[PDB]
Amino acid sequence: VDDEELNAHLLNEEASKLKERIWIGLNADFLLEQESKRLKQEADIA
Amino acid sequence: LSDNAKTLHSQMMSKGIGALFTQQELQKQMGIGSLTDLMSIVQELLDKNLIKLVKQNDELKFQGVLESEAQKKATMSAEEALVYSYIEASGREGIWSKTIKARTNLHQHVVLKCLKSLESQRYVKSVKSVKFPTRKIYMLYSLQPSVELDIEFINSLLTIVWRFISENTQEILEFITAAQVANVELTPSNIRSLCEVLVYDDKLEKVTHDCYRVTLESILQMIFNYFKMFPASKHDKEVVYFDEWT
């Protein structure tokens, strides 16, 4: 059930690091997730 | 103005935190001004909430604290930092949550909503204390559980020390170091406590105020012979009971 346009459905390879810089420029949810995940280990010895 | 306050706190942080300072040496140390304007910058330094006023009994006493904890408590609001002062005043033995409510007049909801935020600020932990179980005890991260261990598995320590005396208090202390025993701190007082449980069971005997001899329970271990005494207990109405007289 192949085709040609969904076969072309794939990223812009030179606009990858263009796009994730925008995606990382909007995101902070995993940021505070990280030091809370780092807090899961800190409360183990506390 | 500011520079006179910069000199005095450098004198407060000059000495190691002990030897709590007072005024009678402070005017000897910083007496370039009269007492009328010396107090006014210290009350302004109280307005800059660095100096605190500690108490040695029946008299007036001062104590300076570091700038590092002063900045983090300035992030809090009025009531937020106010309750944080009570826990850090306790310090070593914790403090009970209901007693904190008594020293504030803040009722049960507003105190619990404050410290819910305060644990996320990583300044306060909750420990389980044993001299009054199931009470809320708060400390810093400085970890003073001054209040061996209450839960079981003392018998694993206890059953081996009988075997050392079976073949026949200072002689125990070298033996307990080896054999990968799961211990962290022993003391000659603990072995004295560990031995007298066996005295109450008559597993061995106390002679000459520190020596110990075995009461020959080994032949009982393997009328005063309670082992191998199995009863009939079925289809026999003519048995003897110790109860059923009351």
Burial of B56-85, coded b for 16+ CB within 10 Å and e otherwise, reads: eeeeeebbbbeeeeeeebeebeeeebebbe
Query: What domain range is B98 assigned to?
Result: 69-139
DSSP three-state, residue A3: coil
Q: Contact, B117 vs B80, CB < 8 A?
A: yes
Backbone angles phi, psi at B66, to 5 degrees: -75, 160
Interface test with A, best of B119, B121, B122 (most A CBs within 10 A): B122
One-letter amino acid for residue B218 of the chain: S
Q: Which residue of B has its CA nearest to A39?
A: B122
* CATH code, B96: 1.10.10.10
B72 Cβ contact partners less than 8 Å away, ≥ 6 residues apart: B123
- Chain A / chain B CB contacts < 8 angstroms: 3
Q: Which residue of B has its CA nearest to A36?
A: B120
B141/A39 CB distance under 8 A: no
Give the method used.
cryo-EM
> Which own/partner contact pairs does B88-91 have at CB distance under 8 Å and 24+ positions apart?
B88/B140, B90/B138, B90/B139, B91/B139, B91/B140, B91/B142, B91/B144
CA separation for the pair B5, B197 (Å, rounded): 63
Q: Contact, B140 vs B123, CB < 8 A?
A: yes
- Which of chain A's residues have a Cβ under 8 Å away from the Cβ of B122? 39
> From the centroid of its chain, how far is CA B116?
24
Instruction: Indicate the pairing of strand B204-207 with strand B211-214.
Output: antiparallel
Q: How many residues does chain A have?
A: 46
Token pair for B106:
């803040």
DSSP E strand boundaries for B21-145? 51-52, 63-64, 125-127, 137-139
Nearest to B131 by CA among B89, B186, B93: B93
**Chain B contact residues (CB < 8 Å to A):** 122, 125, 141
A39/B125 CB distance under 8 A: no
